Amino acid sequence: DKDDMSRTLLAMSSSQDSCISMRQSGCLPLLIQLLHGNDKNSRGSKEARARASAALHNIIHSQPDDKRGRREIRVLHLLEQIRAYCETCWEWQEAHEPGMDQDKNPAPVEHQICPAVCVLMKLSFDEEHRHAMNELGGLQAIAELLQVDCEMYGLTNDHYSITLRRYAGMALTNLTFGDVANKATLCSMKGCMRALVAQLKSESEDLQQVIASVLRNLSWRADVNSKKTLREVGSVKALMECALEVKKESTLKSVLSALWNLSAHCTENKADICAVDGALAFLVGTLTYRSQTNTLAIIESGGGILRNVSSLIATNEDHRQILRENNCLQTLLQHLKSHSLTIVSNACGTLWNLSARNPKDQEALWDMGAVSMLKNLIHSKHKMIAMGSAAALRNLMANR
Amino acid sequence: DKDDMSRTLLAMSSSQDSCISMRQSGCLPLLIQLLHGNDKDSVLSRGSKEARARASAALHNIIHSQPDDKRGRREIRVLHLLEQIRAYCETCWEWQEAHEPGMDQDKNPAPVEHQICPAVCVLMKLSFDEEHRHAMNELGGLQAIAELLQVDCEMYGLTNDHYSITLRRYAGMALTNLTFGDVANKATLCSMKGCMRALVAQLKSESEDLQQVIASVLRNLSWRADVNSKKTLREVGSVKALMECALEVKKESTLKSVLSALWNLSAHCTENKADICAVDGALAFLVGTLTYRSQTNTLAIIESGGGILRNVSSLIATNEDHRQILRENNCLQTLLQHLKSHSLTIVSNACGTLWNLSARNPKDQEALWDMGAVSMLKNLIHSKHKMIAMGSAAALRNLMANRPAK
Amino acid sequence: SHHYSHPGGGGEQLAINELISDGSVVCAEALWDHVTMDDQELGFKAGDVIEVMDATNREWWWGRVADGEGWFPASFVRLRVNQD
Amino acid sequence: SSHHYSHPGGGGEQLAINELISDGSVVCAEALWDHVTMDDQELGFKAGDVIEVMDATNREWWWGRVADGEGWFPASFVRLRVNQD
């Protein structure tokens, strides 16, 4: 196979500053492909990857002492420690495998790699470092460390385990932020994705938050393959299920912020939300919950999810009933009196879908006096409210 | 060849609500490929106009099928403008073809350039906010806009007509905004070899406003360019065109954008560095920028020019003739004054350029000593900024090795 | 009329809120004076160290000084990642 | 160290702002918040004030002018209008 192209790439790297021309030639992406390549299993053997990272060391270390030349060495050094550690874990997994004679001396202790992943996490907050991690294949390395640990100790409560799970995740947050190509790469890592989604059931609500924002980022401006993957790994259902059980306000904020993105993808995701028991009641419950910090943060995200899923609820009487018995329609009208742009916009969008093709509720809105409230918002400064108002008014005026 | 794909996509677009699931199933990229087909590589994807008229219509249905969501209002507004452009280019290729080749051109059609100017105008104006750019990128705006500029350049090369200049200016600005901070777009525009040659060719224009517009596109493209993009920019001779342009520009704002593009390109490779020094009077001119104070942003050109030189100084160092061209234009003197500067860019550039030039030449080693460089470099070896600190101490090391008197 | 809340969706962010979660305190240095007459907003002067309490949104963050608390635009602030 | 308008890496990317002034047409930007500066090199202003953009070659800082005077100011503070007055 292409084991040999790593032999030639290392040989080109060996000579005194001929690796300067290699980066010019664009060998870095080729090196990363041998080391992580999932551009689709384009990553070579262990002996092949040993050569690659070595050649990759030689090329980055054969630069001038520039500012960009010192970030790359600082970063690569850390990534090399992570890569080397991952090699310890993969060797353990192959040795402690079904059919394998488990009677020979190797276990990798997590505590040694946590300081290394800590630094990277902190550094990923800087754009310049992100750019460097990006061309050094940082994202994939950080992600590989995440998945391999979850695979080894599934949902443990060990402090040192949680910590690295939390660090790695926070870096993957920064690295996917605004980066369309990184959101795609991580989503293509199907093994790592399942690991992430699986951590939502962790008892650590600090970690659950570090999973929620990652899935939030991945669901923002996602490509078609990414939206497909996020759907397939059932992240939607997983999030909703952990939201029904989260205690901390911050954790909920994060979780709801992710679902709000995902609820805009497809009617398949909308249905997935509605399928979960008590989810709808929970959402309607959020329509009145005020947070300690950022008062209306949950009302906004809750009403937003509901605003999206309201399109489906309109077809279901049972789901309109769950909505009616948790006092939704009445709450949405009190939302119209709000001073918030987001809150009003959600209520209008929600009432839009709910006011049509159902006399059972559209008479209830009349008896609530919604007409005297919507006419206040037909001449508003934003169409979303204005069109949300008049269309709901049209649905009501049809039934007098 | 594969029209049947285009054929089937229109048929799925036929049903009024199955358009929603299509976008969801990921059809917009597929539809844009039939229209433009960027992904392809030279010597191993666009459909025929028959199939393109099917695809652009199917696009119109998917985009118009969604509700009055803010995206909807945005995508309809943009697509409408993109449809105007695509229809006009089709008129062009229909005239460009069947009118240029060896066939008999005795058949009644030429496309009027006047109607499409207000169309790009809006697109360019809308490209100034992220929200519409993302909408354009979902609808293959960059491509459609680029293809327009190219096909116009291929029709009236270096025309100097007011209505045509305005068009090229407007499209170019749209390409600038859409490339800005967009990795994927930069690479796409660079893959348009024809359009790339069309843009570079426009630097010969005697409309300095358009020259500025072109330099801005090239500047964006030369910033954090991937390996291919860098390779393309070099192969079309954008470096040579830009340096040749700089020597013949009157308006300073035009110059500001040009040097800025060269500064980015100069870093890429030695080959690009060689291209700058090969242009006659270029080096001399770059030295002239070291003392050129601008009207607005007074230190703009000194930074721009200093940087380009800082990059090529490593190549200048080996050439004795080029060192002389500099000597003639009091280069080392000026750089010594750049150390006193209050600007991070300028100071750094100086002891970057002084770093390179101080070594492997006893001729300029004497001069710097006779100028009293030591005292000035000595004042920067412990600089808060480590590049300045390094460059200076490195140049001081060069000079301390060569002293005639104590 | 100021809007601290963008109604698009959940959007995207960095891991700032996560720097808080573990119980540790993270804060940010003021780059410019934030002048406001609104009780909803936290005004400050350049060089002031503001503790960020919420950074869910990208435009506006909820922060607090020993005086009080309110909204402010993130632009006015460089945040310190390391020990504080 | 003072406010660095410098940007020393290279002549990086920017939107097509400078290209709107090229016509001879005047581009405006409405100030979102007060800019407090006691540096005669910089241009202080108040919220709602309309600033004429002169140079926006750099990303972080632009050169503007008012009926009073001119100087540097951070882009963040300002929302530019691309159309007519």
From Swiss-Prot, chain C:
Q: Which residues form the SH3 domain?
A: 23-82
- Tissues in which the UniProt entry reports expression: Expressed at high levels in the brain, skeletal muscle and testis and at low levels in the kidney, lung, small intestine, ovary and prostate. Expression is aberrantly enhanced in most colorectal tumors.
Protein purpose: Acts as a guanine nucleotide exchange factor (GEF) for RHOA, RAC1 and CDC42 GTPases. Binding of APC may activate RAC1 GEF activity. The APC-ARHGEF4 complex seems to be involved in cell migration as well as in E-cadherin-mediated cell-cell adhesion. Required for MMP9 up-regulation via the JNK signaling pathway in colorectal tumor cells. Involved in tumor angiogenesis and may play a role in intestinal adenoma formation and tumor progression.
Instruction: Give the comment on domains.
Output: In an autoinhibited form the SH3 domain binds intramolecularly to the DH domain, thus blocking the Rac-binding site.
Q: How does it assemble?
A: Isoform 3 interacts with RHOA and RAC1, and (via ABR domain) with APC. Found in a complex consisting of ARHGEF4, APC and CTNNB1.
What protein am I looking at?
Rho guanine nucleotide exchange factor 4
Which lineage do the record's taxonomy fields give for this organism? Eukaryota, Metazoa, Chordata, Craniata, Vertebrata
Q: Which part of the entire sequence is included in the shown chain? A: 172 to 255 of 690
UniProtKB/Swiss-Prot annotation, chain D:
Kindly state the tissue distribution recorded for this protein: Expressed at high levels in the brain, skeletal muscle and testis and at low levels in the kidney, lung, small intestine, ovary and prostate. Expression is aberrantly enhanced in most colorectal tumors.
First-to-last residue of the parent protein present: 171 to 255 of 690
According to the record's subunit comment, the protein's assembly and interactions are:
Isoform 3 interacts with RHOA and RAC1, and (via ABR domain) with APC. Found in a complex consisting of ARHGEF4, APC and CTNNB1.
UniProt name for this protein: Rho guanine nucleotide exchange factor 4
Which cysteines in this chain are paired by disulphide bridges? Answer: none
Lineage top rank: taxon: Eukaryota
Function statement: Acts as a guanine nucleotide exchange factor (GEF) for RHOA, RAC1 and CDC42 GTPases. Binding of APC may activate RAC1 GEF activity. The APC-ARHGEF4 complex seems to be involved in cell migration as well as in E-cadherin-mediated cell-cell adhesion. Required for MMP9 up-regulation via the JNK signaling pathway in colorectal tumor cells. Involved in tumor angiogenesis and may play a role in intestinal adenoma formation and tumor progression.
Q: Which species is this record about?
A: Homo sapiens (Human)
Task: Name all SH3 domain ranges.
Answer: 24-83
Q: What is known of its domains?
A: In an autoinhibited form the SH3 domain binds intramolecularly to the DH domain, thus blocking the Rac-binding site.
